[PDB]
Amino acid sequence: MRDLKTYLSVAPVASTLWFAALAGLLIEINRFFPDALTFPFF
Amino acid sequence: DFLVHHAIALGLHTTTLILVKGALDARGSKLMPDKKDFGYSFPCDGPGRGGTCDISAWDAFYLAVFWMLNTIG
Amino acid sequence: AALYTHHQYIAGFIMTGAFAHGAIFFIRDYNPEQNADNVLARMLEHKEAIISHLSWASLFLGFHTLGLYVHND
Amino acid sequence: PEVKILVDRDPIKTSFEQWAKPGHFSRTIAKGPDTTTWIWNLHADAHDFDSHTSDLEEISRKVFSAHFGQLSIIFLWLSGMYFHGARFSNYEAWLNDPTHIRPSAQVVWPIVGQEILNGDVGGGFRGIQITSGFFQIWRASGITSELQLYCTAIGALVFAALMLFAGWFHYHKAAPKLVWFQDVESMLNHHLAGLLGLGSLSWAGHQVHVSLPINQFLNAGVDPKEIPLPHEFILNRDLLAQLYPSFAEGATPFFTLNWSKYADFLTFRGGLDPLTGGLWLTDIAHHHLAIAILFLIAGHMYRTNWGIGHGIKDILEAHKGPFTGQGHKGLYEILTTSWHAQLSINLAMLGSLTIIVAHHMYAMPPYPYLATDYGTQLSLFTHHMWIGGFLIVGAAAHAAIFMVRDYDPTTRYNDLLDRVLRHRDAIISHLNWVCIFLGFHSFGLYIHNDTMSALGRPQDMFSDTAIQLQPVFAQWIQNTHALAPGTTAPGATTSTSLTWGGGDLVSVGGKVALLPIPLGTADFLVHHIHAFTIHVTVLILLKGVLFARSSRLIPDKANLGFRFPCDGPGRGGTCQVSAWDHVFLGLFWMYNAISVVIFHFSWKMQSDVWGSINDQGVVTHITGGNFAQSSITINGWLRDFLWAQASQVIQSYGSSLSAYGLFFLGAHFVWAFSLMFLFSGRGYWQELIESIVWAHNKLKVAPATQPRALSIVQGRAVGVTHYLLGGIATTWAFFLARIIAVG
Amino acid sequence: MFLISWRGYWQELIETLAWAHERTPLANLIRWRDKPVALSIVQARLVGLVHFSVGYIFTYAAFLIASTSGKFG
Amino acid sequence: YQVVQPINGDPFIGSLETPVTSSPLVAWYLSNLPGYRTAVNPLLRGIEVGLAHGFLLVGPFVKAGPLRNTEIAGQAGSLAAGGLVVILSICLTIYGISSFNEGDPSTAPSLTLTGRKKQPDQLQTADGWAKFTGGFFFGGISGVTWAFFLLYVLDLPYF
Amino acid sequence: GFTPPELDPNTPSPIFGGSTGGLLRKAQVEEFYVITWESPKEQIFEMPTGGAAIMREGPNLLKLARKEQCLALGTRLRSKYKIKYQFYRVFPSGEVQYLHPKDGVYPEKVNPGRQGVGVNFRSIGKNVSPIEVKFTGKQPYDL
Amino acid sequence: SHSVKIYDTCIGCTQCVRACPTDVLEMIPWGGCKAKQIASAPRTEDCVGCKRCESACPTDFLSVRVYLWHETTRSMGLAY
Numbered sequence A: 001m002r003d004l005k006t007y008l009s010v011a012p013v014a015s016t017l018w019f020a021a022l023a024g025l026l027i028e029i030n031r032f033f034p035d036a037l038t039f040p041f042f
Numbered sequence B: 001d002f003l004v005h006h007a008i009a010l011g012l013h014t015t016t017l018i019l020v021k022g023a024l025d026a027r028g029s030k031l032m033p034d035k036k037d038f039g040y041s042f043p044c045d046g047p048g049r050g051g052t053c054d055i056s057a058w059d060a061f062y063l064a065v066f067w068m069l070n071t072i073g
Numbered sequence C: 001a002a003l004y005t006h007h008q009y010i011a012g013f014i015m016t017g018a019f020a021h022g023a024i025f026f027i028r029d030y031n032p033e034q035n036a037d038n039v040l041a042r043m044l045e046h047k048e049a050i051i052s053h054l055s056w057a058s059l060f061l062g063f064h065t066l067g068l069y070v071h072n073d
Numbered sequence D: 001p002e003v004k005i006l007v008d009r010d011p012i013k014t015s016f017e018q019w020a021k022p023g024h025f026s027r028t029i030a031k032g033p034d035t036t037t038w039i040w041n042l043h044a045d046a047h048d049f050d051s052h053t054s055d056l057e058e059i060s061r062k063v064f065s066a067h068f069g070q071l072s073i074i075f076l077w078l079s080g081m082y083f084h085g086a087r088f089s090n091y092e093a094w095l096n097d098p099t100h101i102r103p104s105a106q107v108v109w110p111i112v113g114q115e116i117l118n119g120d121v122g123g124g125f126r127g128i129q130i131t132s133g134f135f136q137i138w139r140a141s142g143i144t145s146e147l148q149l150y151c152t153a154i155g156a157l158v159f160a161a162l163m164l165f166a167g168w169f170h171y172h173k174a175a176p177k178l179v180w181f182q183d184v185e186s187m188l189n190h191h192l193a194g195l196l197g198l199g200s201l202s203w204a205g206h207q208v209h210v211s212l213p214i215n216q217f218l219n220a221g222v223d224p225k226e227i228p229l230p231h232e233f234i235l236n237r238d239l240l241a242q243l244y245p246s247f248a249e250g251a252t253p254f255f256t257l258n259w260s261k262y263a264d265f266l267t268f269r270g271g272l273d274p275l276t277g278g279l280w281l282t283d284i285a286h287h288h289l290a291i292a293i294l295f296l297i298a299g300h301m302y303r304t305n306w307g308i309g310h311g312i313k314d315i316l317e318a319h320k321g322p323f324t325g326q327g328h329k330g331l332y333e334i335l336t337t338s339w340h341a342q343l344s345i346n347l348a349m350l351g352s353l354t355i356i357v358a359h360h361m362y363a364m365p366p367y368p369y370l371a372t373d374y375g376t377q378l379s380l381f382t383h384h385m386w387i388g389g390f391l392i393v394g395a396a397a398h399a400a401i402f403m404v405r406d407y408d409p410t411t412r413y414n415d416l417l418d419r420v421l422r423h424r425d426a427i428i429s430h431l432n433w434v435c436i437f438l439g440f441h442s443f444g445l446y447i448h449n450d451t452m453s454a455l456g457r458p459q460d461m462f463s464d465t466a467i468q469l470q471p472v473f474a475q476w477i478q479n480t481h482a483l484a485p486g487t488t489a490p491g492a493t494t495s496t497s498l499t500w501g502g503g504d505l506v507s508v509g510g511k512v513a514l515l516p517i518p519l520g521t522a523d524f525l526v527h528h529i530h531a532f533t534i535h536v537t538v539l540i541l542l543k544g545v546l547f548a549r550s551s552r553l554i555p556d557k558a559n560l561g562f563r564f565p566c567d568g569p570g571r572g573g574t575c576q577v578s579a580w581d582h583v584f585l586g587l588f589w590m591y592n593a594i595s596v597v598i599f600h601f602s603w604k605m606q607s608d609v610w611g612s613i614n615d616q617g618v619v620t621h622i623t624g625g626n627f628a629q630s631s632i633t634i635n636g637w638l639r640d641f642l643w644a645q646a647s648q649v650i651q652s653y654g655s656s657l658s659a660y661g662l663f664f665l666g667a668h669f670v671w672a673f674s675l676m677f678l679f680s681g682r683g684y685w686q687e688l689i690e691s692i693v694w695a696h697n698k699l700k701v702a703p704a705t706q707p708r709a710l711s712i713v714q715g716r717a718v719g720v721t722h723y724l725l726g727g728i729a730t731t732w733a734f735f736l737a738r739i740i741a742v743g
Numbered sequence E: 001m002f003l004i005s006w007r008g009y010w011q012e013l014i015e016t017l018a019w020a021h022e023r024t025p026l027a028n029l030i031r032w033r034d035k036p037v038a039l040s041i042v043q044a045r046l047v048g049l050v051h052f053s054v055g056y057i058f059t060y061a062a063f064l065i066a067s068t069s070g071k072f073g
Numbered sequence F: 001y002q003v004v005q006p007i008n009g010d011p012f013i014g015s016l017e018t019p020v021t022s023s024p025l026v027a028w029y030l031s032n033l034p035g036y037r038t039a040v041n042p043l044l045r046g047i048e049v050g051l052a053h054g055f056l057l058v059g060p061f062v063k064a065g066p067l068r069n070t071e072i073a074g075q076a077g078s079l080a081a082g083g084l085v086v087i088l089s090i091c092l093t094i095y096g097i098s099s100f101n102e103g104d105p106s107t108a109p110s111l112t113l114t115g116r117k118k119q120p121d122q123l124q125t126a127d128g129w130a131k132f133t134g135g136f137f138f139g140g141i142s143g144v145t146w147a148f149f150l151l152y153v154l155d156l157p158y159f
Numbered sequence G: 001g002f003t004p005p006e007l008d009p010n011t012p013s014p015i016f017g018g019s020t021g022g023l024l025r026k027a028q029v030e031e032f033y034v035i036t037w038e039s040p041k042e043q044i045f046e047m048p049t050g051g052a053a054i055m056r057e058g059p060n061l062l063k064l065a066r067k068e069q070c071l072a073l074g075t076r077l078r079s080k081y082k083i084k085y086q087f088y089r090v091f092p093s094g095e096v097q098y099l100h101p102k103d104g105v106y107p108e109k110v111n112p113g114r115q116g117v118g119v120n121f122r123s124i125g126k127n128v129s130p131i132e133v134k135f136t137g138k139q140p141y142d143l
Numbered sequence H: 001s002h003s004v005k006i007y008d009t010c011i012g013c014t015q016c017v018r019a020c021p022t023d024v025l026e027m028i029p030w031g032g033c034k035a036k037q038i039a040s041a042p043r044t045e046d047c048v049g050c051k052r053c054e055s056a057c058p059t060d061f062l063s064v065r066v067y068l069w070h071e072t073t074r075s076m077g078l079a080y
């Protein structure tokens, strides 16, 4: 468990998880507001 | 025209980077502090200290010629 | 078209040569003590800020120009 | 002396301690990172087991377990294939009308407007067309519904899990001992008989029961869903009796040696099936039966435990003549103590085998409705060619690694290897001369033709209408092949392939499957170009292997190791003297050779083979036979091949093939990017990184792990990797777009 | 070529070539007077750059003149 | 029994003894060629070499030349062969001038295969090489002229 | 002061089957090198030019075309087989020149009978710039 | 012949001498450090310019410097 946590935070694994989360977030934002070329709210 | 002009600016800045870096570091740097005693053009300083390929100022000019050709192209 | 391409390529070669000979001067004809604290010596002593900022400009231009081109494509 | 099962219990206990420590294998790496270079090293030596330790037993155990892991990966890949075919494919629609529907087994979710890639492939389906040729394999196997594909996918997943567990269990619970790995006689006996022979017998048994009756029903025109299930043909035997009467007697012909009675489904026809455009399945079943017999016999050669058999040492040491001293004496000990020797031999053989597979597979198509699926044919040929070339280059890499590391005349001395090392200079000099001579006469003729055409002197050109260079030998050989059936091979009705001759063009669904391929002056020139490129790459690789240990330049090159940048700027400069650098150059030359080979194949097929048949029998070829007259000059290759056929890919924007154009441009980019690494040296980059690091130090944001520039060898490796990726990917996109739009 | 392949390979190749020439009948009667050697590192870089530039210029000049003159418009 | 041996039994000289390198018939044939007739006047050896080479060169120029189809194929090819012989004579003369001096002895080896003395071949001197190259030029022009005369000037059915 | 050993012909040479990496014309017209060692017992070693050779019992003499080859062979003889060696340079005139170990003790161990050559009594960073030695035949490091 | 220089920062570690592949360097008596040793270059005519000695020097900057100079048949490492 402790060693699993340690290995699960090593550079490659942490980076892949971070970028998967970022990709999912951006994908969902684009899905809800697609084809957005300007900021119209204000 | 906007996009291509910015490509032109990129080319100018990178060629100037290569040439300015080659000039200002000609007299020596941290990797080869005594470069001034080895002349303008020389192959390298051997594979020691991690490897010193293309460490001369002549080699900086050499790498800048490619970027000049690309930018003028 | 021929004349324009002609003169632009020759101008690029001339500029690259000018920088090459600046580096050559640094190597050969530069006297650190006789140029103590003048503009040339001060250029030599903060070379790293110049090189780093020029690198930043190149990185910005390349990143964003290529990004916009690839986006449109 | 005897062959038995030997293992050791619990050599390594499964745990997570070493996961937390990056790079446990190397002591200095285990200590920690000082600079960023460390990180790269950690990956560069991940699978270099023979360097982390020196015990043969540990290396062998690691190799066995890694083999299990890779086998698990392959099984997972196959399970993914079968699942995608089962769920995200139009396999049944294609099965109902093969020539009508374009195979597809991949859809893309609609997220950022990428749904344009879900093109109209037919059969009420929208997806990405696949060129892997899986649909033809499934049709040839007798798969008719998606339930069977689902079952195969689940089974492959289970076998992937089993492979993974086997790897874990064999490395951590029961690790075979060294004498077990060194038992090569029994290994060869089992692989020849237990694996190849028995596997071929099993596949023949499947084909007799499932492939033959199912494909016969399919070709008879029965709808796929109305066909009896593959198991019924086993329960009730009259089902088989109807299609082939000889099943009525059942096995008694096989035991009374009345094998002629099995001529119904065990034939020697040859050629192609006029309906499906592939090989007769009754020929493939007989093929696999004969192969099974041959391998089951050949796997009884080497002695294991019962006296009868052959000792490989005896066979090796019994061969030697006046020209080679005591040759073959000592090779058995070399090949059973060094893994790199075996790896190099096997890599060379597998690369050659893959190349031969490509050649034979486009020669006579073995799957139904594969010949007229031009995209599939082109993609399969090109893929196998590239795989084979890479494996062959790896053969040289590992031969050089063995030469540097495991070669030792004090303890393991071989005579043939010694003589080769003693006249390497003559070998390489003559090979160099051959390379120069071939280069001048193959490419020089192209330059001559180009210059004559530019000067308006077509009468002086090396063409079919000016100065002919006819490959008389190849023409004679293929003529002898055309006349073969009924003369020299009486039992065959049709020639082995339709490329030999004899006319009998075969077409399917209005498209040309195959027809005789003519050989002319352009074929002569391109074949000599092929020979030139192969010889030059062989020169590079052989020179790297032979001069790996020492030369007249650096007499102690072995002490530096297999991989190293140089030996300084002394002696005029010793850049790229190591064997690894020779492999690095051989990669470029292999890329050149394979690119030319695939270009020749594509253009020749389009010009003289592929095309559309019409009512009167007039064949209109994709390219109107311009290869014979345009391929003899470089300008023709640049204009009539690259320029003309790039139109399909460059226009792909706005359609389902837009991804191919995107990959075309991206591959161009990556290839040009590689030149950044291939042309520069690390000194300039380190000096620049110094200024960057200073800029970071000014803001208290400098990394603790000092950022060093890439090593020299790493710079070369990155350059070659990017070069190969870019070139191969741009060719991939070009071929796929061209053949999908025009095919 | 000169930009990717480097000196050591060519030096060893030339060594074996010298052996071969010295070991053959009727041609060993002819003897070179300057010992053959591979091009220097700096010289190889310069030759590679010169080839790169000459090819660049010639191909672009051909393209530009042919395309503008082909249409004359 | 082993076929390949070190040179003269000396295993530290960069070469080997092989049937191709040193077989009775091959050794005799090579020793009986003009280049290796050490004790013969260099002019006559040059004459033989030039005759052989000039006669050799005519064929390819005549048959494969740009004017092969034209009626003047023989004349054009013979002139080209003569010109090539002239250029080869130029090359020989400059090589001899650059590689030899009047006041120096022969650079040829003075020892034979059994270790006994012998007069070094005079071909490797300045005047010896001058005589050899003059003989080669004369013989080459004569050979080109003969090959041209043998064909075209005289029918003589060949091929 | 350590009379260098004199080269002794007639000493047997190692058993070797011939190679294409041996001497060439440079040995004939310029110079070649000779290395000698003792080797207590007959054994097989790796040649610096080709394959494997066998050292004869007693003295062994081997002639090479490069000094670097002699040094590589000596290093292998010294570290692998624990053998003492010396090699010479031979000119076409018939001269022999003792080369290594120059003063009877290998160059690795300090000897009280050696003078300093090319030693600068200053740090490498205190060399004059080229401008100070311009138009003089000297180089900044030669000072 | 390449020019090899030894500078006074040398600590007499001997690592450069072990590295030279032509026996150009030596150890000589000296008194400015604990080892009473310093490197010498009495046979630079046999130097091939490999700069393998500099790769072994642990001082910063180097104490042994190789300046490539006029090339000879010995410096070019030619066996022909």
Ligand code: CLA
Pocket: B010, B014, B017, B018, B063, B064, B066, B067, C055, C058, C059, C060, C061, C062, C063, C066, D669, D670, D671, D672, D673, D674, D675, D676, D677, D679, D680, D688
């Ligand atoms: C297509 C060829 C190519 C490309 C793309 C580049 C690009 C670059 N060169 Mg280079 N160069 C080239 C050829 C090329 N060069 C050749 C042939 C030579 C002759 C040897 C040189 C010699 C040279 C020198 C000497 C120098 C450069 C420098 C630079 C950088 C300048 C900074 C900049 O513009 O910001 C960025 C430009 C970009 C194009 C961005 C590239 C990264 C994009 C965003 C992709 C991101 C990755 C993406 C997520 C996909 C990842 C995939 C996954 C598998 C990892 C830049 C990255 C200078 C430098 O280092 O800058 C300080 C420098 O000094 N070049």
Ligand code: CLA
Pocket: D012, D013, D014, D015, D016, D017, D018, D019, D061, D062, D063, D065, D066, D068, D069, D070, D073, D164, D165, D166, D167, D168, D171
């Ligand atoms: C399932 C639990 C498990 C656990 C806890 C361990 C734990 C351990 N194993 Mg082990 N092993 C396992 C399963 C396991 N293994 C299996 C199933 C196999 C068969 C393949 C092996 C075979 C094996 C070998 C041969 C060796 C070990 C070794 C080790 C030890 C060293 C660190 C390590 O694991 O490497 C690092 C951990 C990783 C996760 C590395 C990644 C490896 C996977 C296979 C990569 C997946 C490939 C991927 C698809 C590639 C495509 C890339 C793409 C995704 C971009 C460690 C105590 C080594 C050892 O004991 O040293 C003496 C040793 O040599 N294991």
Ligand code: CLA
Pocket: F065, F066, F067, F076, F077, F079, F080, F082, F083, F084, F086, F087
């Ligand atoms: C740069 C100047 C130059 C000139 C003026 C020529 C001129 C010629 N070339 Mg050449 N060529 C050149 C450069 C040149 N070339 C270069 C750089 C190359 C390398 C790419 C070639 C490659 C080349 C080839 C491969 C061939 C030619 C051929 C020819 C001839 C073809 C026309 C013909 O049939 O005439 C008349 C035809 C004749 C056979 C008469 C021969 C010419 C005279 C009579 C020979 C007398 C020579 C004289 C003794 C002087 C010796 C040379 C001396 C000045 C040192 C023509 C005389 C073709 C040819 O004719 O073959 C020889 C041919 O095959 N050229």
Ligand code: CLA
Pocket: D063, D064, D067, D068, D071, D180, D181, D183, D186, D187, D190, D191, D194, D195
């Ligand atoms: C009938 C006997 C038999 C069979 C069929 C095989 C088959 C195979 N062996 Mg193997 N081997 C055998 C006997 C056999 N061996 C014996 C007696 C020895 C000792 C001398 C060895 C020692 C040996 C080594 C050292 C290696 C192999 C490897 C392999 C695989 C090669 C890669 C391949 O082609 O994948 C083909 C894939 C398939 C055919 C898929 C089905 C796989 C089935 C389930 C295999 C089951 C056979 C196995 C021997 C069953 C016994 C285990 C039992 C207790 C459950 C292959 C699956 C290599 C490997 O590890 O694989 C990557 C390898 O490194 N074998």
Ligand code: CLA
Pocket: D043, D044, D045, D046, D047, D048, D049, D347, D390, D391, D392, D393, D394, D395, D397, D401, D562, D563, D580, D583, D721
């Ligand atoms: C069954 C085939 C096989 C096997 C088992 C091996 C095994 C081995 N090889 Mg080898 N090799 C092979 C084939 C094989 N090779 C072939 C075909 C070639 C020719 C290309 C080579 C050329 C080669 C060289 C030059 C070297 C080895 C080396 C090694 C050893 C260490 C490799 C390592 O872990 O480094 C680390 C491995 C990596 C860092 C992985 C590299 C990742 C690649 C470059 C990326 C691939 C890109 C992908 C296909 C597409 C892009 C995806 C991306 C965008 C996400 C190891 C024992 C090394 C050695 O020292 O031997 C002892 C070494 O120097 N091999």
Ligand code: CLA
Pocket: D440, D441, D442, D443, D444, D445, D447, D448, D451, D460, D461, F060, F061, F062, F064, F065, F066, F067
């Ligand atoms: C290797 C490629 C190659 C080849 C095979 C040819 C071949 C030919 N060219 Mg050519 N050419 C080439 C490249 C090539 N070219 C290139 C790169 C250029 C520059 C762009 C030219 C430009 C050119 C021009 C301008 C012309 C030709 C012409 C010709 C023809 C006559 C040339 C001639 O007579 O020369 C002389 C031939 C010889 C002296 C023969 C020497 C070779 C002998 C036969 C082989 C010796 C080996 C021997 C067998 C070894 C055995 C030893 C044993 C006896 C001991 C001929 C068929 C002419 C023509 O009219 O075309 C029809 C012509 O005018 N070429």
Ligand SMILES: CC1=C(/C=C/C(C)=C/C=CC(/C)=C/C=C/C=C(C)/C=C/C=C(C)/C=C/C2=C(C)CCCC2(C)C)C(C)(C)CCC1
Pocket: B023, C018, C019, C021, C022, C023, C025, C026
């Ligand atoms: C009138 C007018 C105007 C004005 C303007 C101005 C006034 C500005 C400018 C300008 C400028 C501002 C320009 C510039 C340029 C620059 C350059 C071109 C540069 C450079 C550099 C270099 C070249 C370097 C060299 C060297 C070195 C490197 C170091 C050593 C020394 C030497 C010097 C050698 C305008 C147009 C707006 C508008 C209209 C009106």
Ligand SMILES: CC1=C(C/C=C(\C)CCC[C@H](C)CCC[C@H](C)CCCC(C)C)C(=O)c2ccccc2C1=O
Pocket: D676, D677, D678, D680, D681, D682, D685, D686, D708, D709, D710, D711, D712, D715, D716
């Ligand atoms: C660019 C270049 C370098 C520099 C190469 C570098 C700096 C490697 C760059 C790798 C990445 C871009 C940096 C490491 C990324 C980290 C993992 C941090 C990522 C964090 C976020 C950005 C995700 C060389 O060292 C070199 C050496 C020899 C010949 C040519 C070259 C050469 O062309």
Ligand SMILES: CC1=C(C/C=C(\C)CCC[C@H](C)CCC[C@H](C)CCCC(C)C)C(=O)c2ccccc2C1=O
Pocket: E001, E002, E003, E005, E006, E007, E008, E010, E011, E037, E038, E039, E040, E041, E044, E045
């Ligand atoms: C091919 C090659 C060689 C070998 C190149 C050789 C031996 C040159 C041989 C060329 C001959 C002499 C013919 C060249 C013809 C030229 C057109 C003639 C130019 C002469 C004057 C007109 C200037 C290297 O030595 C080398 C070294 C370092 C990096 C790369 C390389 C490299 O690529």
Ligand code: SF4
Pocket: D570, H004, H019, H020, H021, H022, H023, H024, H025, H046, H047, H048, H049, H050, H051, H052, H053, H054, H066
């Ligand atoms: S450069 Fe090489 S040969 Fe010269 S002194 Fe240094 S280590 Fe010795």
